[PDB]
From a paper:
Ubiquitin chains that are linked via lysine 63 (K63) are involved in endocytosis, DNA damage, and the immune response. Ube2V2 binds and orients the acceptor ubiquitin, thereby generating specificity for K63 linkage. TRIM21 detects antibody-coated viruses by specifically recognizing the bound antibody.
We gained additional insight into how Ube2V2 positions the acceptor ubiquitin by analyzing a Ube2N~Ub:Ube2V2 complex that we solved at 2.5 Å resolution. By invoking crystal symmetry, this structure shows the orientation of an acceptor ubiquitin by Ube2V2, so that its K63 is pointed toward the active site of Ube2N, an orientation comparable with a structure of yeast Ube2N~Ub:Ube2V2 that was solved in a different crystal lattice. Without a RING present, the donor ubiquitin is not in the closed conformation and our Ube2N~Ub:Ube2V2 structure thus represents an inactive complex. Alignment to our Ub-R:Ube2N~Ub:Ube2V2 structure reveals that Ube2N and Ube2V2 are packed more closely against each other, resulting in additional contacts between the acceptor ubiquitin and Ube2N, that position the nucleophile K63 much nearer to the active site (4.8 vs. 7.5 Å). This is achieved because Ube2N N123 and D124 contact ubiquitin via the amide of ubiquitin K63 and the sidechains of S57 and Q62, respectively.
Author numbering:
A (entry chain F): 1 to 73
B (entry chain C): 1 to 76
C (entry chain I): 1 to 74
D (entry chain A): 3 to 152
E (entry chain G): 1 to 152
F (entry chain D): 4 to 152
G (entry chain E), I (entry chain B): 5 to 145
H (entry chain H): 4 to 145
Amino acid sequence: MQIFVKTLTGKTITLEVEPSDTIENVKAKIQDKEGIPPDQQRLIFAGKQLEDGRTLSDYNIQKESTLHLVLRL
Amino acid sequence: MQIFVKTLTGKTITLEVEPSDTIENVKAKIQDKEGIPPDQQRLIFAGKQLEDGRTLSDYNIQKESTLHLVLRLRGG
Amino acid sequence: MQIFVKTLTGKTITLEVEPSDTIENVKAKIQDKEGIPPDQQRLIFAGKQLEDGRTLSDYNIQKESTLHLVLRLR
Amino acid sequence: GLPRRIIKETQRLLAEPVPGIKAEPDESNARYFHVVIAGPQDSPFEGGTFKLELFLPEEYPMAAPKVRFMTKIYHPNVDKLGRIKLDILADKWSPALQIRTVLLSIQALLSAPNPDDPLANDVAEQWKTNEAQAIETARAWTRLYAMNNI
Amino acid sequence: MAGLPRRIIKETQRLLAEPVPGIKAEPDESNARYFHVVIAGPQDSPFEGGTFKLELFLPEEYPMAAPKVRFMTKIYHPNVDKLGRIKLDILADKWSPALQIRTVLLSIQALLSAPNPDDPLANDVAEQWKTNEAQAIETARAWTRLYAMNNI
Amino acid sequence: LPRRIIKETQRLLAEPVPGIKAEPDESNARYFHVVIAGPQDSPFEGGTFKLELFLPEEYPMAAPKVRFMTKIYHPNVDKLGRIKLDILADKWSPALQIRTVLLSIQALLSAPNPDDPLANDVAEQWKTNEAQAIETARAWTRLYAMNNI
Amino acid sequence: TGVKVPRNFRLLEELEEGQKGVGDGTVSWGLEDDEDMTLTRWTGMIIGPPRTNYENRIYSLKVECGPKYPEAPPSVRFVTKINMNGINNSSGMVDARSIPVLAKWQNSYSIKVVLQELRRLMMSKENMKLPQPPEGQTYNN
Amino acid sequence: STGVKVPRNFRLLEELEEGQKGVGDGTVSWGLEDDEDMTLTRWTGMIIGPPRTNYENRIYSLKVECGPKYPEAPPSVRFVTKINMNGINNSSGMVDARSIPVLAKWQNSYSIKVVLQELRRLMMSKENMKLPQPPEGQTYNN
Amino acid sequence: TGVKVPRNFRLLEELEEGQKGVGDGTVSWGLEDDEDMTLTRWTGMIIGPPRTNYENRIYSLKVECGPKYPEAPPSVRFVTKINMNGINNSSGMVDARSIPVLAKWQNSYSIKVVLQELRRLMMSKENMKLPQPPEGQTYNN
């Protein structure tokens, strides 16, 4: 399955994921594509901030959904 | 025979030539000694501008005469 | 026997000498320890300027006395 | 009064300017033109804007126009004082030639330098000896004097 | 009578009437003991082409005391320091009243032609005169061109 | 004038921080002139650095704003003297006081760390060739951080 | 009635606000030197107002903020030549009396409002119909 | 005329050589600013506060300027570290020559040593000894 | 009636004739920098006229041609010392009013004629028999 996360600069990046994957995994999976270390990333979806420990299925993130990436200053 | 051409500077160059030689030949042979490009040269002698196709004997240029060399005023 | 050489810079150097030794010899031995060429050295002892030709015993310079070293500027 | 050739050439040069070249009369001398030439692309002078002066002498068009750079430039045909070595500005001038064609010839000279005739001998020899270092030196000079001087 | 000691008058007169070749020197109109001196860099020296300003003052005890001389043109030389002071034997302990101003000037001019780094003034300049003499002479030529071009 | 600002200013004057000078402006009590001596065993040793400190109107809810006025070679100070340190930004807490801000800037001078870079240009060289960075900082110290008075 | 913000921190506010272009775009301002810790020399620019002789002529200016900024007004000077009441034509310096925001300076003001005031006075009717020099001319010095 | 005059530069090198070699108490001290400036115009001076005063044991730094007419004309003097004193301007630090006797009545026998010693003697004046002195470590601008 | 030659082209004419020894040889002139595209700072030289106290003394001068040259006159300054009416004796600068070609400047004039009239003024009876300083003396600045 593929999902998209948009940073607030205005870019969209596409990742192939599995619902099994944890959010720490997708953060590493963003880092591999954009070089942004996972410690500076914050992922938000459907009015909720995602925790590193839980999974995509925990938040009910289904096929080609879109999350938003806020960068920590 | 040897003849010389005096430039507008006041320098004199002497080259051994023969009546056989064309004025194109005299231009190329002054270039051979002082490097002035042949197309930038104009030769004048006895009230006449010499053309490249003819020879010294046509212009009745005999032993140790002096031609005058006018350079086209190329700024630099 | 040992003698001392005191410069006006404020340092004292000790030389082991013999009474047989000439002042020329003492100058060379301070040069070996302080690098000062003997022609720039002038040695003074008991109100007298020591000359190169004489010996320590000529000047009655005995054990652990002190000479004074003045450096010539030129 | 001014020659009708100078007026019609000035008018045709302002209504239809040469691409990459600005040229305009001085408001106090109509024979005096302020010129700006953009560094041609794919040449060490790209990015730079080069100031030039042009004056139409009293005998124009029988005499060639007088042109010189005012921006310092590294080029085999421009010397320390901005003078230009170009055949049409000297012995190979013809009265049928126009100002716009002189400007075009200077613009082309900027992209096609030729050290066969050296007005600035040191720059021409550097160009023939080590063209790579000559081109990068000219690029450096472009960045020095032809930028931030507009 | 005579304004000041007559030796000063006669030496001033002989220095103006018969000057030393390569050295210009003349009194100040407001101090007769004060002389403005110009020394041309001798040929066969790194200072050739340069003109060097110097000051000379005749102290109150002259000729029993030595004249005071100093450079005012900056110069690269083992016997001249940052402020133009000159280390010269005859200007110090080796002065004798029989010496004359002309010969002091001549010895300074000669000092310009034969620098010798045994004297320890301007220690860095002397030890680089011993270190890379070629670079020392090219430095002295550079300094000659820097400070002595437009001085007079 | 807030009752905290008077009591903090007085204790900064009664017990100054070793190696740091700080005093209010006689025309602005929220405005302080600061001098920080270069810490020992560091590339800035020997230097004395001027800083400005301002306590904004919402202090202590807003952080004090401080900046260098002596130009300094350091990964956390930019060309114009602005300082990058969390305690002056997102990790400011109203329980913090001026004394600890000044102490933290002094500590930053001895432990420069370029992983979070303000002026990334000096910081990436502090990573690439730290030795030449340290001696460049020493040169800048001798240039701008001496001859101060 | 509240307290004042010191000069340098106010100038750093104005510097950061000059770089993130919020607002009209008719005015723009920034540091001249970019590394000048004094924060004294600023460059300003005004775009000519429509419906004027100034229209779409871009003017660049030099603004100097003194030791008493923003309690005292800054000196402003045109570098692109211009004919304007209050604007000297030999220097380009601005007559403070000619500008209300400079004749009646208040520390609530910024460099943005000074430039926006100059553009509004370019839309003033004693200036909009003045004869202007040819574009590209500037005083020297 | 009653004596010989020493021209400027030789006198200034005289004063420099004695400024570096332990002259007198040490309550005053002077030297060149540039140390390589052949003009010999710009000097640095320093005064130790006199006993029994509000200036006491405060080190004051000054800038003394010897012009082309030294020592026939008096030198310019300026405090750089702040001080409260009659004759010393409080925004600049410049010294009023008229307020200082050795500058108001200048004589070519005087030196910068004597000017500094006069400022220190004037710190013991009873109009000056009990002024309020600014906090130590403060300095004027420039 | 005539056409005006702009500054730089006229100065390049004057530069070329200064290097090709046209005329007397009593005067000579050239660029100071040789690479100064401004063409502003010139060096001039006058040989003392015979029958004067100036005779066979080489004088060097500094001539500066301003932005309005040759419609405005050039500034002239002696660097080698000289006693002459119009020449200040502490500085060496020339008083324009005392010299006709500078007091009545005309755009047909050049720096060559400025030097030639200064040499003509050395043979004037108010200047020719003045006391001159020793050869080799010069002002500073």
